[PDB]
Write a protein that binds this ligand. Structure first.
Ligand SMILES: NC(=O)C1=CN([C@@H]2O[C@H](COP(=O)(O)OP(=O)(O)OC[C@H]3O[C@@H](n4cnc5c(N)ncnc54)[C@H](OP(=O)(O)O)[C@@H]3O)[C@@H](O)[C@H]2O)C=CC1
Ligand SMILES: CCCCCCCCCCCCCC(=O)SCCNC(=O)CCNC(=O)[C@@H](O)C(C)(C)COP(=O)(O)O
Ligand SMILES: [Zn+2]
Lengths: 114, 297, 95, 208, 134, 86, 126
């Protein structure tokens, strides 16, 4: 249980890196909506950033959230520099996908998936 | 229910939706997005086309292999209509014109061809027929469009009594002739009140009318969330577009206000959230670029 | 040896035909259902039974290395002919 | 066993065994196993803290001069708790020989980057990041190199499916190539080809 | 009529004649609109307004453990004691034997091949019965 | 309304189930004579803690732990079950 | 020091990029595969496998092919021991269930038993 760290010795430094990455994304979202000329609003993209950060809000391992900050910086670097196109940025917004059945009964109606 | 038309899969491109649709008028503005939203479910779409097959190319990426069948048809030929509808379980009628031509006038486009399609679908055992009228269709209207379209609504109802007649108000989208008309007109301001509706809302409503058995024999009125005056709507279109082919029938229809029929169901009785103009006006009018939102009533 | 359903659709040598109410007949509408009319079960039935005088015969389908593997067919049953498992040619012991 | 059997190179086997002893006793801080294959290839199996000392030794020693990094590779073996096996294929032009340097990590422990030893490694270990998720610490520009820009997961892991999780198509509604969950019109038909009979008695693992 | 899954079509707990609980696995899916059986009963309870407190198969098996916890201990024979108490309870009401002799319903190989709804729908079992009668 | 079934779970060999086993060895026969049409489901298992499930009308099930009890405590809990009908 | 103390359960589900549908609703099966009774060889019964629950396979409307939407439908892993397999399933957040290994019990083979004086185990032929 003695493991070699990545960047963070414990979870406080890890949350510091999560917090700085969130600051960087929050600053970037208006530029992304402008230069990719997205059809979303800045508040909507910021809600998507908050959704992506709250998706990983259960992690208690410092190395795992170090890798999450690293991959978030890689996503940010692909978005600031125009390496992604408009399609890669809009793949966060699952727009052409049909709304999946949520409760038991509609999932029972359409098929066999639990 | 036959075994090949039982739905399967997770509702994707290679899935089976159990919807076998013949979409008359599928090469137009509404038929584009309807064949789009049908073929992403895994539906067998039948496209009778009048036009050059080059003009149906954009429909081929819209579904899986063998799921869009193209075939020739003529509006005055019942044999081709029968050859198109005899295997479908839903026929959607989208045949329309903004202008009348040398061969097909407003009566042929809105009365003759819709009643022929509905009658031939009736005698071919097609369970569902979905006809598209206009919201402002009236026998006593000033435009020949709306008179013939109200007469065709009447005939489609009395020859296919379980049909789902739908009343879009003024559909706006990328390929519309509502916001793209105002962006290019560069006619005047009057007492007209309109509530335009987004094309994805209309398409989701037509598909939710296909799926809901409670839409048989009904008449829906597809309207947007917000009623606008005509003048500040046109000024909002010129403000979004960063701006400072017509006929008198189109002028009669622009200066015809959208009637409100609360006795008819709408998009919310099909479970569709009506998208306002302020979200999608930039998506429509970004092409016209080389904003305070519009005042509702 | 192709036969025809009451819908007018041809039947393959498998026995496949679409039903009257199956929607998948719309793929042949304005086009053709391509079947092969040379049914192999009818063509191998036209070949005569080979009379041979041995108790065990061999068959490789003709052509040596152009046929199938060489198999040995017993002919002790006088009620039934001995049929090749590969080519379907059938043999009878003449005594 | 003359015409069809590959002839054994005993001279190179003895030479690579002696050089493996040499490397194992110069660097006993990191060298775990040294093994020479039957087709005369030398593998040095090391502890991952000695990526830079072992590779810098093999690059700079007068009896090594493995100046060329041929290939750098991860192999995913999921039954090992250090599932990723980082393989270094080195080439000596002075002594006309090749050596394999192997080390391990799991998904979370980083391996030290070897661009200070071989500048060839810059894209290779970046490909190892892209395909396996093995993070390389103190790398100049570590990011993806082969997958698409919005790609989630690491494809050469063995718990990753053959067709992935998303597939693309053009959608005419949004005027945009979109990503939707993957559905095959024909599923990839998995073939259980393995014979129930043992093929190689020399490789028989001893029973429990 | 409610179309259900067969034993090749659902993961499903069956207990043999000796008390060993065992689960099948999904080989194929049910044909057409046919569903898994407890899915149908649970959807019926949701329509009727008497919704059953389980949604997934694991929760059905938690209920199944609550009713008797040896139905979820798979490939385990659990021994059952207390023959003496069942014997003492069996001596209470003296039931009399009928004069009819013990005749099992399956006397020859003819009566073997068709017993349940899957065997009676089988053409191979029909060939077996026709072959053993002639 | 009233009691419908009683379920008793126990281990065959655990000392926590010793009181439940000593209940079933002695008092279950006159329990079943006293309750002729009540299903009393004794369900032995391998490593379970002892447990007294009581199902009342309309699917309502109360749950009583019988762990480390004596036979007298099992008799008292079970007669509380038979006297409640709640 | 350069070694930290992580006292948490090893869970890499956020890092593998698998969607939540194919993490939280899938059931891994950890098992030694049964011997094909068509054959007497036992070499395929040596390693632990991890497969998943089989989801829907439906018919292609065009060709009749077997269409699928399950990505993990062909995913079979191989483990040396059961504990490596369980650790891999717990590390990836997969719900699993484990069948124990079934070895054939040792048999008492006697060729002389086929020709006994007074036992029922005589063969009637050979
Ligand atoms: N904003 C809107 O567009 C609104 C439209 N509607 C109604 O919805 C329907 C579809 O609208 P929309 O897509 O925008 O209109 P379009 O003009 O863009 O499309 C009409 C379709 O009908 C076909 N068509 C037209 N005339 C004939 C003819 N004489 N014979 C055969 N086919 C013909 C066209 O095919 P081809 O290329 O071969 O001519 C095309 O596929 C129409 O009935 C319209 O009145 C209602 C409310 C608002
Ligand atoms: C256009 C769209 C752009 C999309 C951008 C997507 C980028 C996604 C980057 C994701 C990076 C991460 O997930 S790092 C987050 C993981 N952190 C943890 O697990 C630690 C727990 N974190 C928290 O609780 C965080 O809320 C805080 C802020 C650190 C502390 O909050 P608590 O206090 O309450
Ligand atoms: Zn032959």
């Amino acid at each position: 249980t003695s493991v070699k760290p990545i960047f963070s010795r414990d979870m406080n430094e890890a949350k510091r890196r999560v917090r700085e990455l969130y600051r960087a994304w929050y600053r970037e979202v208006p530029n992304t909506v402008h230069l990719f000329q997205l059809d979303i609003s800045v508040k909507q993209g910021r809600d998507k950033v908050r959704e992506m950060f709250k998706k990983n809000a259960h992690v208690t391992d410092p190395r795992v959230v170090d890798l999450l900050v690293i991959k978030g910086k890689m996503e940010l670097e692909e978005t600031i520099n125009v390496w992604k196109q408009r399609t890669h940025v809009m793949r966060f917004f699952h727009e052409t996908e049909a709304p999946r059945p949520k409760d038991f009964l509609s999932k029972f109606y359409v098929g066999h998936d639990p | 229910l036959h075994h090949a038309v039982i739905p399967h899969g997770k509702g994707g491109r290679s899935s089976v939706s159990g919807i076998v649709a013949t979409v008359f008028g599928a090469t137009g503005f509404l038929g584009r997005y309807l064949v789009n939203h049908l073929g992403r479910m895994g539906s067998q779409v039948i496209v009778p086309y009048r036009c050059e097959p080059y003009d149906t190319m954009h429909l081929r990426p819209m579904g899986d292999l063998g799921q869009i069948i193209f075939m020739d048809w003529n509006g005055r030929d019942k044999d081709s209509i029968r050859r198109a509808v005899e295997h479908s379980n839903v026929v959607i009628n989208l045949v329309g014109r903004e202008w009348e031509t040398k061969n097909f006038d407003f009566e042929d486009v809105f009365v003759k061809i819709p009643q022929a399609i509905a009658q031939v679908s009736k005698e071919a055992g097609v369970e569902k027929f979905i006809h598209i009228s206009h919201l402002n269709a009236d026998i006593k209207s000033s435009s020949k469009y709306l008179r013939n379209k109200a007469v065709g609504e009447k005939e489609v109802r009395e020859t296919f009594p379980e049909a789902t007649i739908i009343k879009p108000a003024d559909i706006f989208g990328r390929e519309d002739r509502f916001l793209n008309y105002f962006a290019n007109i560069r006619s005047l301001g009057k007492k007209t009140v309109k509530q335009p509706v987004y094309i994805v809302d209309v398409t989701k409503g037509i598909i939710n009318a296909i799926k809901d058995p409670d839409a048989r024999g009904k008449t829906f009125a597809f309207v947007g969330p917000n009623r606008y005056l005509l003048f500040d709507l046109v000024q909002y279109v010129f403000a979004v577009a960063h701006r400072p082919w017509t006929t008198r029938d189109k002028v009669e229809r622009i200066h015809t206000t959208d009637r409100t029929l609360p006795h008819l169901p709408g998009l919310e009785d099909l479970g569709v959230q009506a998208t306002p103009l302020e979200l999608k006006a930039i998506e429509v009018l970004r092409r016209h670029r080389t904003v305070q939102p519009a005042k509702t009533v | 040896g192709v036969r025809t359903s009451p819908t007018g659709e041809k039947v393959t040598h498998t026995g496949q035909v679409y039903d009257d109410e199956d929607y998948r007949r719309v793929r042949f509408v304005g086009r053709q259902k391509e079947v092969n009319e040379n049914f192999a079960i009818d063509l191998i039935a036209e070949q005569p039974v080979s009379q041979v005088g041995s108790r065990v015969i061999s068959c490789d389908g003709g052509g040596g290395a152009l046929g199938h593997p060489r198999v040995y067919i017993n002919l002790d049953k006088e009620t039934k002919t001995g049929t090749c498992g590969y080519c379907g040619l059938q043999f009878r012991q003449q005594h | 066993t003359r015409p069809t059997v590959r002839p054994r190179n005993d001279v190179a086997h003895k030479q690579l065994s002696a050089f493996g002893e040499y490397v194992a006793e110069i660097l006993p801080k990191y060298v775990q196993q040294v093994q020479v294959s039957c087709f005369s290839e030398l593998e040095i199996c090391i502890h991952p803290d000695g990526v830079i000392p072992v590779l810098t030794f093999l690059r700079d020693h007068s009896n090594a001069q493995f100046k060329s990094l041929a290939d750098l590779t991860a192999v995913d073996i999921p039954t090992r708790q250090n599932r990723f096996e980082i393989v270094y294929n080195l080439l000596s032009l002075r002594f006309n020989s090749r050596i394999r340097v192997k080390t391990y990590t799991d998904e979370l422990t980083p391996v030290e980057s070897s661009v200070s030893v071989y500048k060839a490694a810059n894209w290779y270990e970046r490909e190892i990041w892209d395909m396996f998720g093995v993070f390389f610490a103190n790398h100049p520009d570590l990011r993806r190199i082969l997958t698409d820009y919005g790609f989630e997961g690491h494809p050469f892991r063995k718990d990753f499916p053959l067709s992935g999780y998303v597939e693309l198509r053009y959608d005419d509604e949004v005027k945009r190539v979109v990503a939707e969950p993957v559905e095959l019109a024909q599923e990839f038909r998995k073939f259980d080809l393995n014979s129930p009979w043992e093929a190689f008695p020399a490789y028989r693992q001893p029973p429990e | 009529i409610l179309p259900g899954a067969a034993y090749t079509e659902k993961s499903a707990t069956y207990v043999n004649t000796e008390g060993r609980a065992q689960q099948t696995k999904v080989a194929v899916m049910p044909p057409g609109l046919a569903r898994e059986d407890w899915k149908i009963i649970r959807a019926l309870s949701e329509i009727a307004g008497m919704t059953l407190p389980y949604d997934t198969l694991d929760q059905v098996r938690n209920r199944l453990e609550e009713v008797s916890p040896n139905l979820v201990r798979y490939d385990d024979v659990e021994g059952a004691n207390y023959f003496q108490q069942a014997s003492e309870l069996s001596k209470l009401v003296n039931q009399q034997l009928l004069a009819d002799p013990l005749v099992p319903p399956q006397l020859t190989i003819k009566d073997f091949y068709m017993t349940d709804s899957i065997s009676r729908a089988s053409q191979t079992m029909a060939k077996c019965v026709k072959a053993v009668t002639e | 309304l009233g009691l419908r079934e009683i379920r008793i779970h126990l281990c065959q060999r655990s000392p926590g189930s010793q009181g439940v086993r000593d209940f079933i060895e002695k008092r279950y026969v006159e329990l079943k004579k006293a309750n002729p049409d009540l299903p009393i489901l004794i369900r032995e298992c391998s490593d379970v803690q002892p447990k007294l499930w009581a199902r009342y009308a309309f699917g309502q099930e109360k749950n009583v732990s019988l762990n480390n009890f004596s036979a007298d405590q099992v008799t008292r809990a079970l007669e509380n079950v038979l006297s409640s009908k709640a | 020091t350069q070694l930290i103390t992580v006292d948490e359960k090893l869970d890499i589900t956020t890092l593998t990029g698998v969607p939540e549908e194919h993490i939280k609703t899938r059931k891994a099966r950890i098992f030694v595969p049964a011997r094909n009774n068509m054959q007497s060889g036992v070499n395929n019964t040596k390693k632990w496998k991890m497969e998943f629950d089989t989801r829907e396979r439906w018919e292609n409307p065009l060709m009749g092919w077997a269409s699928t939407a399950d990505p993990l439908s062909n995913l079979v892993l191989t483990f040396s021991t059961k504990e490596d397999a369980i650790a891999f399933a717990e590390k990836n957040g997969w719900s699993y269930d484990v069948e124990e290994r079934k070895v054939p019990k040792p048999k008492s083979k006697s060729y002389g038993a086929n020709f006994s004086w007074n036992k029922r185990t005589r063969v009637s032929t050979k």
